[PDB]
Each structure stands twice: as structure tokens, then as C-alpha cells.
Amino acid sequence: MVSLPRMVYPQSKVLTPCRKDVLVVTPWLAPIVWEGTFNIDILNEQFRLQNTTIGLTVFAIKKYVAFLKLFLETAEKHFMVGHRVHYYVFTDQPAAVPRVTLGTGRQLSVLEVCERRFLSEVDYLVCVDVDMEFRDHVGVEILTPLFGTLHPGFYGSSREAFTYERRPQSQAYIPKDEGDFYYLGRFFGGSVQEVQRLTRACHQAMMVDQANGIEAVWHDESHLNKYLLRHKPTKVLSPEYLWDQQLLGWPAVLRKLRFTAVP
Ligand SMILES: [Hg+2]
Ligand SMILES: [Hg+2]
Ligand SMILES: [Hg+2]
Ligand SMILES: [Hg+2]
């Protein structure tokens, strides 16, 4: 917890919003991360002084191993560059993992398809899908105890339109008058402790649903949304962090498209 060094950067105007087109803070005072809200130089300093290590987990089975090359190569160019990164690739085809060149301070572990390991190797965990590619900066501005990401297909929708599980018989049930945002099941993270807490809750909830003979409409995503409704995330990432340009184009509200679906 050392002091930051002298830094020179423009002063922020208290009587001027940084973004006048979007909500940059939630009702529970968690920032909503949009381009323009953060000074990456200040944040990089803070996390480097803590010698932060970020774990990135991807789950790639069968035909999905084909997406690993692009995923890892683009992560090397845009994900936590400058910081310690540990990639965890869970796959059923260990020998199929591409030999990707990694920058210094970055490593990759192949796990064929433990929890204690995460607590000892990384400070934060980021969980995403492999059939994606990084197109712009995704850095320490996302790090926090627990974060969710706004689904690109519902950020401007009314909660009634959110595709939450609507059947009371499911543990993921959320009535029409409840809900803050519709988060992505495929891009969340936080401290190892909070991430495992969320995954453990989701695992237990899905089992209860299975015993009751019911499956949530959007499976894991439905449960993650129930969890984040009851345990507010300490940071919320804007749709800049998970977008589909083919289906949604490039709206003016999006200054950057950082992580996207592959056509
Ligand atoms: Hg994970
Ligand atoms: Hg859950
Ligand atoms: Hg689960
Ligand atoms: Hg979950």
C-alpha cells in the first residue's frame, strides 16, 4: 500500500460530467466503466504498485479449441498489458492448444477436463468465453472485488424486457418489478474469493433446479443475474466490454469496442 509517484495530468472539472450520454455510477455507488470515466495511467500505477496478477479463464471444448489462437493472440495485445497475467485454458484437447507467443510476465496453464490454486496464483479472476477476440484495451479499470458486464442486447431495455428466469419454481426467478441490469453470464470476474463465492452459489442453485426438474431459460446466465441482483457488483462494465458488431453495429454511445464476438 505504497504512495503513488508525482504524476502530471489534466485536472478534472467538478462542475462538468465526464459523460453526459450515459449513466456512470449505479445506485449503490459502483462505477459503470465507460471510456472517458478513467485515467488508465493512474489506475495502472495503483495496480502495478500492488504487483497485481490477473487470471483469465477460458473454457474450450471440442470444436471451440479452434478459437484459442485468435483469442490468446489478441489478449496478448489488449488484455492487462504491462501486468502479470496467468491464462487458464480448460480443455478436453490438451495437445490441440495453439503455441502462442506470450509477453514477459505472462504465462499459460493448460488444464485437461484446484480451486485452492487460484487463491495462491492470482489476485483477480476474469471469466470469459473463447469464441471472442480483443479489439481494444481491457485493463485494470475492470478490477474490483466483484464485477458484472452489461449485456449488449439489453443495456437500453426496460427491466420487464430483460430475459431473466421468470418462473417462480426456479432458484433464478426474478419478478418483473425487480432487477437493476441484465448482466452477461460470459464476462464476469473479481477477487478470487468473490468469484468462487458466485460460482459456488450458481452451482448449488442449478442443482436445486435440476432436482426440481427445471432448467433456467438462459442457464448459468440466469443464475448469475439472480446472484448479482442479491449481491451488488462493486463495478459494472459497459457493453464496450462485450459487443457483437455484426448484430448491433457501432452506436455513437460506444467510443470503443474492446471485446467482441467472432463472425
Ligand atoms: Hg472463472
Ligand atoms: Hg446464483
Ligand atoms: Hg453454475
Ligand atoms: Hg453463475
Please report which residue ranges of the chain form alpha helices under DSSP H. 40-48, 68-78, 115-121, 192-211, 220-230, 245-248
Catalytic residue among 141, 165, 194, 221: 221
In the chain the first and final C-alpha atoms are separated, in Å, by 44
Q: Classify strands 32-33 and 235-237 as parallel, antiparallel or unpaired.
A: parallel
Give φ, ψ of 250 to 5 degrees: -140, 85
- Yes or no: say if 255 and 36 are a contact pair by the CB < 8 Å rule: yes
Report the DSSP beta bridge partners of residue 189. 126, 147
How many helices (H) and strands (E) in the chain? 6, 10
Residue 261: what residue type?
A: A
Q: Which CA distances in Å does 218 have to 57, 147, 226, 242?
A: 21, 19, 12, 17
For residue 222, what are the contacts with CB-CB under 8 A and spacing of at least 6?
164, 165, 170, 172, 185, 216
Beta bridge partners of 183: 150
- Separation between Cα atoms, residue 6 and residue 94, nearest integer Å: 47
CATH architecture of 1-263: Alpha-Beta Complex (3.90)
Per-residue cell: 140: 485494470
Instruction: List beta partners, residue 111.
Output: 90
Whether 194 is catalytic is no
Distance (Å) from CA 18 to ligand 4 centroid: 32
Question: In the PDB record, what is the listed experimental method?
Answer: X-ray
Q: Which residues pair with 89 in a beta bridge?
A: 58, 110
CA of 203 to the centre of ligand 2 (A): 7
Q: Is 45 annotated as a binding residue?
A: no
CB count, 10 Å around CB of 177? 7
CA distances from 200 to 33, 147, 193, 195, 203 (A): 26, 16, 11, 8, 5
Ligand number with the minimum distance to the CA of 122: 1
What separation in angstroms does the CA of 146 have from each of 5, 72, 107, 235?
28, 24, 24, 7
Beta strands in the chain (DSSP E): 32-33, 53-60, 84-91, 106-112, 124-128, 132-134, 146-149, 187-191, 235-237, 259-261
Q: Is 35 annotated as a binding residue?
A: no
Alpha carbon 10 to chain centroid distance? 29
CA of 114 to the centre of ligand 2 (A): 21
Please check if 59 is assigned to a binding site: yes
Taking the C-alpha atoms of residue 196 and residue 189, their distance in angstroms, rounded to an integer, is 9
